[PDB]
Amino acid sequence: HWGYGKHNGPEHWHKDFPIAKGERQSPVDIDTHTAKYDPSLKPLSVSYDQATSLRILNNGHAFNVEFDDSQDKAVLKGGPLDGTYRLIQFHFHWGSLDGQGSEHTVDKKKYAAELHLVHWNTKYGDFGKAVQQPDGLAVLGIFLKVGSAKPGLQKVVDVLDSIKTKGKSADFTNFDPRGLLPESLDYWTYPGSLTTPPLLECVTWIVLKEPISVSSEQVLKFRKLNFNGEGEPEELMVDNWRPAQPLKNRQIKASFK
Numbered sequence: 001h002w003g004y005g006k007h008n009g010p011e012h013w014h015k016d017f018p019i020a021k022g023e024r025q026s027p028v029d030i031d032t033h034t035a036k037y038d039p040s041l042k043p044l045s046v047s048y049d050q051a052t053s054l055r056i057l058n059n060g061h062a063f064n065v066e067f068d069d070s071q072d073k074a075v076l077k078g079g080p081l082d083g084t085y086r087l088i089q090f091h092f093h094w095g096s097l098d099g100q101g102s103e104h105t106v107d108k109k110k111y112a113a114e115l116h117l118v119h120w121n122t123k124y125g126d127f128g129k130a131v132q133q134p135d136g137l138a139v140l141g142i143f144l145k146v147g148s149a150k151p152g153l154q155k156v157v158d159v160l161d162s163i164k165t166k167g168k169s170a171d172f173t174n175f176d177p178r179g180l181l182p183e184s185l186d187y188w189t190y191p192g193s194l195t196t197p198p199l200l201e202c203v204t205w206i207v208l209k210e211p212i213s214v215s216s217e218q219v220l221k222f223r224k225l226n227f228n229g230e231g232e233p234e235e236l237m238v239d240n241w242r243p244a245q246p247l248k249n250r251q252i253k254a255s256f257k
């Protein structure tokens, strides 16, 4: 079915998911000289103290760390958001080379990877309802650049051997996601979509200005994962990012001046 290969990659997705050519597709290039500071934006409220991570899963396109979202335990609020959005999972998109891997770009700059912390609006009751709503999701996007190690990522890195191939999952409790955050919560925001099929146009994107640094050894271990399942031909899980899509009739706002 869909993937990131040369026969099933982003340029093919529109054939099964025609919304791929839609009006609010993600990711996009963030042109920092065209984004407008919006003083009516509120500070982001990242309330992750009570987060309950449960499991880490290789789903064949990326790996997801999943949380308990049956209560308000880890919630994103404020910024451009009305209401409360519960963290359901985070995952990353990364490259085969350090010069590529992010989905969003900043003045056409590609980062080595991009973290997506995926939240859903509690007014819709469950994640499956929320993805059918234009304000259903809030995804917090954080760029990764290669440099110093990120200590709070290392427990993620060290479990990846146990979920090498598609369909493998591992217990992953007591993981603390604020350890993946940069110092600053300055952000850009725009309305967009899931960046993988089904590409639903249900996401308020919140992309942090400040990237985090991860070590070369950390991102190398992302690149040892496999898209395939066990017993299938090995294909390294690299370059699992969708390129920038047309901005069309959207404005990206900045929370900072």
Ligand SMILES: Cc1ccc(NC(=O)NCCS(=O)(=O)Nc2ccc(S(N)(=O)=O)cc2)cc1
Pocket (backbone or CB within 6 Å): 054, 064, 066, 067, 068, 069, 088, 089, 116, 118, 127, 131, 139, 193, 194, 195, 196, 197
């Ligand atoms: C306890 C628990 C908690 C979570 C779960 N997982 C989910 O529901 N995960 C995935 C949501 S998804 O629709 O299927 N796809 C999707 C999401 C984000 C994006 S992106 N790339 O835009 O951010 C792209 C695609 C399972 C158990």
Ligand SMILES: [Zn+2]
Pocket (backbone or CB within 6 Å): 091, 092, 093, 116, 195
């Ligand atoms: Zn993503």
